[PDB]
Amino acid sequence: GPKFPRVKNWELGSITYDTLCAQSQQDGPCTPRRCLGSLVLPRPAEQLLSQARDFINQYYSSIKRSGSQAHEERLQEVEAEVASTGTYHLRESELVFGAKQAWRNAPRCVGRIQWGKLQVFDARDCSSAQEMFTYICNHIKYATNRGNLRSAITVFPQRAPGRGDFRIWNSQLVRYAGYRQQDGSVRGDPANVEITELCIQHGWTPGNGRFDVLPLLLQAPDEAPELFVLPPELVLEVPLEHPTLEWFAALGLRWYALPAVSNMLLEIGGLEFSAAPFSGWYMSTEIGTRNLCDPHRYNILEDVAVCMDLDTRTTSSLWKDKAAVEINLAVLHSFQLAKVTIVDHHAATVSFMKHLDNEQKARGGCPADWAWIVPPISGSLTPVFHQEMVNYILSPAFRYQPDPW
Amino acid sequence: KFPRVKNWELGSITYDTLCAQSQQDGPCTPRRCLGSLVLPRKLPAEQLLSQARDFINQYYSSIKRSGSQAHEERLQEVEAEVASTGTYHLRESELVFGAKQAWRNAPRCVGRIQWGKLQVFDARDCSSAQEMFTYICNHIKYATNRGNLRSAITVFPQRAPGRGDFRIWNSQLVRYAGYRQQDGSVRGDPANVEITELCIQHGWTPGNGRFDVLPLLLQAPDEAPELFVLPPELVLEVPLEHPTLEWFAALGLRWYALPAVSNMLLEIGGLEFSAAPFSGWYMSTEIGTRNLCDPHRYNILEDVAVCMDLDTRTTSSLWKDKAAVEINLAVLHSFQLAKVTIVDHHAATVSFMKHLDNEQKARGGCPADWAWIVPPISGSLTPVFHQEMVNYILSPAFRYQPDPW
Numbered sequence: 001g002p003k004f005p006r007v008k009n010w011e012l013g014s015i016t017y018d019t020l021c022a023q024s025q026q027d028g029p030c031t032p033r034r035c036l037g038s039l040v041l042p043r044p045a046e047q048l049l050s051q052a053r054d055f056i057n058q059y060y061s062s063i064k065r066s067g068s069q070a071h072e073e074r075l076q077e078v079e080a081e082v083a084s085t086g087t088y089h090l091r092e093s094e095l096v097f098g099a100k101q102a103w104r105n106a107p108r109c110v111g112r113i114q115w116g117k118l119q120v121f122d123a124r125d126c127s128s129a130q131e132m133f134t135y136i137c138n139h140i141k142y143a144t145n146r147g148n149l150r151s152a153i154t155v156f157p158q159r160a161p162g163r164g165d166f167r168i169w170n171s172q173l174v175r176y177a178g179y180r181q182q183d184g185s186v187r188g189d190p191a192n193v194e195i196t197e198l199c200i201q202h203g204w205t206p207g208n209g210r211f212d213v214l215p216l217l218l219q220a221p222d223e224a225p226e227l228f229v230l231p232p233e234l235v236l237e238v239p240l241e242h243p244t245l246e247w248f249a250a251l252g253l254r255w256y257a258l259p260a261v262s263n264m265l266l267e268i269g270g271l272e273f274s275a276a277p278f279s280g281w282y283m284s285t286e287i288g289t290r291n292l293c294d295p296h297r298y299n300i301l302e303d304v305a306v307c308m309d310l311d312t313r314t315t316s317s318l319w320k321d322k323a324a325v326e327i328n329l330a331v332l333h334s335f336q337l338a339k340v341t342i343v344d345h346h347a348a349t350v351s352f353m354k355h356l357d358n359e360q361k362a363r364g365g366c367p368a369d370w371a372w373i374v375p376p377i378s379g380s381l382t383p384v385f386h387q388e389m390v391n392y393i394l395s396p397a398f399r400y401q402p403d404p405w
Numbered sequence: 406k407f408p409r410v411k412n413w414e415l416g417s418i419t420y421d422t423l424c425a426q427s428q429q430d431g432p433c434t435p436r437r438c439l440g441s442l443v444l445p446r447k448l449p450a451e452q453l454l455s456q457a458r459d460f461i462n463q464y465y466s467s468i469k470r471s472g473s474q475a476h477e478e479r480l481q482e483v484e485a486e487v488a489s490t491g492t493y494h495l496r497e498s499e500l501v502f503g504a505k506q507a508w509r510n511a512p513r514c515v516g517r518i519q520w521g522k523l524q525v526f527d528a529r530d531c532s533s534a535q536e537m538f539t540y541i542c543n544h545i546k547y548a549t550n551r552g553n554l555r556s557a558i559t560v561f562p563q564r565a566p567g568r569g570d571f572r573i574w575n576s577q578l579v580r581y582a583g584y585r586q587q588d589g590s591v592r593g594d595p596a597n598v599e600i601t602e603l604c605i606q607h608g609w610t611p612g613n614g615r616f617d618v619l620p621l622l623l624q625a626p627d628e629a630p631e632l633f634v635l636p637p638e639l640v641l642e643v644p645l646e647h648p649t650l651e652w653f654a655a656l657g658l659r660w661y662a663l664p665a666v667s668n669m670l671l672e673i674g675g676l677e678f679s680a681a682p683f684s685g686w687y688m689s690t691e692i693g694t695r696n697l698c699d700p701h702r703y704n705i706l707e708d709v710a711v712c713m714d715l716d717t718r719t720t721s722s723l724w725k726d727k728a729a730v731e732i733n734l735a736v737l738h739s740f741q742l743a744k745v746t747i748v749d750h751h752a753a754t755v756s757f758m759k760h761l762d763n764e765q766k767a768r769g770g771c772p773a774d775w776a777w778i779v780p781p782i783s784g785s786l787t788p789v790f791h792q793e794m795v796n797y798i799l800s801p802a803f804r805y806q807p808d809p810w
């Protein structure tokens with residue numbers, strides 16, 4: 001009966017209707033003619049006001065003062081401010097709310113059961129590249145918490161009419177270098193070739209390992225970016241060993257503890273926070289399957305399978321499968337041993353289902369990007385595989401933005 | 406705008422121009438993507454005529470005789486026939502062309518490299534359940550070919566305005582019974598509980614095995630369906646054993662050789678063939694991962710993991726992942742040892758890539774459903790994972806249709 005998408009779980013045989021998608025003010029990439037849901041990235045005045053108004057309405061509802069006098073005054077305040085300056089400012093608790101809602105809204109994040117629990121560092125007073133560095137170091141220190149990781153975001157000043165953006169050039173606060181060789185190949189992480197070369201151009205003296213931590217390239221309004229080396233003792237890393245395969249430690253593979261995305265734009269009520277790095281903790285397949293096994297990343301599957309003495313000349317030995325399992329286990333075992341928070345893809349997906357149930361009750365649905373929610377190994381062994389998902393853009397949101405260069 | 410499609414492993418970009426030929430709306434709108442949904446929610450002469458004209462045009466263009474006299478007289482024939490009877494009929498060779506094209510256009514099919522190699526049985530001269538059975542038996546006999554599987558479709562008489570459909574009630578020609586036990590459990594295949602029960606009520610003596618091959622319920626128009634036992638010698642099955650684990654074979658697991666979907670509708674030129682069973686050969690994850698390992702299927706993970714002696718008490722030991730690998734490996738080994746055609750998911754997805762390339766040059770695109778093309782284990786270990794895909798409906802097509810009861 002209901003005129004909303006009907007959503008089915010094929011394992012349990014249960015049914016819901018997503019009513020939340022009705023709240024989407026923004027068109028994604030699909031049309032009746034063709035589905036483009038699999039593409040990683042598909043291609044202000046009165047406009048601001050209506051986005052602002054909507055966000056303020058969201059805030060007052062979440063504190064149950066919808067329609068109140070403090071609500072209508074806040075609205076009046078926001079429009080008067082836009083009326084005379086073309087922009088407006090968020091109250092502190094508004095920014096805290098907006099940041100959590102942005103995470104709550106991110107269709108590609110499987111970790112969202114944790115959305116209510118986010119330390120929000122307000123850095124809207126930041127006025128230098130040097131100061132961004134201190135802020136970032138403070139973030140890393142707090143979030144890492146010696147292995148006992150804590151979700152956090154640091155919000156730098158918003159985009160302003162006429163005035164240059166705050167930007168962190170690095171895609172993450174912590175990344176390994178990728179050095180382009182003479183024999184065409186790459187030492188380190190091929191994903192980071194461009195930012196590696198940019199750091200060099202701005203005077204970084206490069207190393208030559210597979211796991212050199214990149215310096216930060218930080219950009220304050222209308223200034224060239226400045227280079228900052230993270231102090232090694234701030235950057236917690238985990239050496240990878242295997243619970244039973246004694247030779248695996250000899251591979252000298254390692255990963256860092258803190259996944260901290262730093263190139264995304266946080267948009268709240270039409271305001272654009274171009275520098276707003278956030279971090280949680282890893283789900284083990286990000287490291288053990290994507291970062292270590294993607295053919296265009298570290299690509300270690302063949303090396304590991306040879307050590308395991310598997311038949312690499314034939315697909316039907318499932319050598320890639322056997323080696324991926326062991327690499328994934330090594331990631332889990334090594335983080336556990338080191339007392340550094342990590343979550344396996346089974347536990348993570350169980351918890352996303354619970355999140356889906358919470359949100360059905362709370363908002364009538366949950367935007368979710370199936371191809372990103374389902375893990376890159378053991379897909380149908382996890383319950384999310386059997387869950388249909390509706391995908392749509394709600395605001396506040398984290399969005400991709402062009403590289404500053 | 407023509408969708409830009411990127412491969413992320415290789416950095417290559419294509420533009421899909423084929424999707425412009427789509428005429429039938431899928432489930433997505435710009436407000437929300439529904440691409441992960443398994444079923445569509447929504448399950449005159451001038452319109453049949455336009456689909457017919459288009460299909461005749463496709464046919465004559467295929468044989469290079471586009472614009473010719475034979476082409477002209479054929480469109481005239483089709484017009485003459487619809488105008489005076491509300492419908493028309495296809496020539497054998499046109500039907501042959503349509504069925505291959507339906508396969509080619511099937512977005513959820515990873516085996517489309519094979520699309521041009523399809524044996525087509527014309528069963529349009531069929532007037533009874535009895536004759537359906539003969540036809541179905543010849544198909545099985547042919548497609549099976551002592552283990553050397555050969556792609557085949559048998560096409561029964563089209564739907565007609567006046568009367569009921571020809572239908573095969575079973576979802577595949579060979580399927581195992583599911584017996585609902587008093588205490589809520591299922592003996593045998595849980596996906597087949599309902600069809601198992603329809604056969605019993607239509608008069609079949611059931612067994613009590615986990616792998617009892619079902620009879621067929623065949624329905625000639627406006628008649629009660631009829632029961633037919635397949636002669637056991639026509640149903641090739643593969644006992645499941647493991648290359649190294651001796652106990653595995655003691656599990657008594659087995660599977661049939663011929664995946665022969667019998668519940669989908671074949672639409673060519675606006676004509677609908679409600680009974681048109683098709684078969685190829687299995688991709689091993691269909692058996693090893695979905696049928697045996699799905700929680701709502703035979704759900705054998707725990708059983709195996711205990712045999713392999715794994716720590717079943719915790720998700721992070723990856724017992725599930727370890728067991729799945731051995732089960733898939735056992736399926737490949739057993740099929741190879743019985744000389745029965747099987748393709749592993751690495752070889753299959755590699756051939757799909759090749760197909761995508763052939764289709765890009767030939768047609769300017771390929772409709773593909775990412776969530777179905779990527780295998781249920783080792784997704785990112787296969788090339789298709791990293792390949793963006795556009796999904797849309799082209800005609801001739803295979804469609805879903807209501808269960809006839």
Ligand code: HEM
Pocket residue numbers: 103106108109110111112114118151152153261264278279280281282283286343348372398
């Ligand atoms: C608490 C532990 C967390 C876990 C296990 C988690 C898990 C994930 C995973 C597995 C992805 C997909 C990553 C990829 O394939 O590249 C993801 C993406 C995302 N996550 Fe979460 N997350 C967590 C915390 C957070 C926090 C605190 C935020 C924001 C405040 C967040 C927002 C996002 C966003 C915006 C994306 C999309 C990034 C992109 O599209 O490239 N996550 N997260």
Ligand code: HEM
Pocket residue numbers: 504508511513514515516517519523556557558666669683684685686687688691748753777803
């Ligand atoms: C040649 C050997 C073949 C292999 C290895 C192959 C592989 C596959 C696989 C893995 C799926 C996903 C099915 C699922 O998850 O249930 C699939 C679906 C499909 N295949 Fe192919 N296929 C082959 C031949 C064919 C032929 C001959 C046709 C038609 C003439 C065909 C048409 C389809 C259709 C219509 C679907 C969608 C089924 C559904 O929605 O449940 N396949 N095939």
Ligand SMILES: C[C@]12CCCCC1=Nc1c(nc(N)[nH]c1=O)N2
Pocket residue numbers: 038039040371372373413790791792793
């Ligand atoms: C596989 C696909 C879809 C499209 C191709 C590349 C992808 N990229 C990613 C993805 N999922 C996750 N979590 N991460 C990706 O980078 N999904």
Ligand SMILES: C[C@]12CCCCC1=Nc1c(nc(N)[nH]c1=O)N2
Pocket residue numbers: 010385386387388441442443776777778
């Ligand atoms: C996982 C998903 C997406 C939606 C939920 C159930 C599915 N069904 C299947 C699927 N892909 C394949 N190949 N087969 C399925 O049965 N995709």
Ligand SMILES: NC(=[NH2+])NCCC[C@H](N)C(=O)O
Pocket residue numbers: 111259260261279280281282283286287291
């Ligand atoms: N768990 C997270 N918060 N992940 C954010 C994405 C991190 C990225 N996938 C990486 O492997 O570094």
Ligand SMILES: NC(=[NH2+])NCCC[C@H](N)C(=O)O
Pocket residue numbers: 577664665666684685686687688691692695696
């Ligand atoms: N290879 C094929 N033609 N598959 C069609 C679907 C068969 C279905 N996956 C099964 O496990 O029985």
Ligand SMILES: [Zn+2]
Pocket residue numbers: 030034035036037433437438439440
């Ligand atoms: Zn879509």
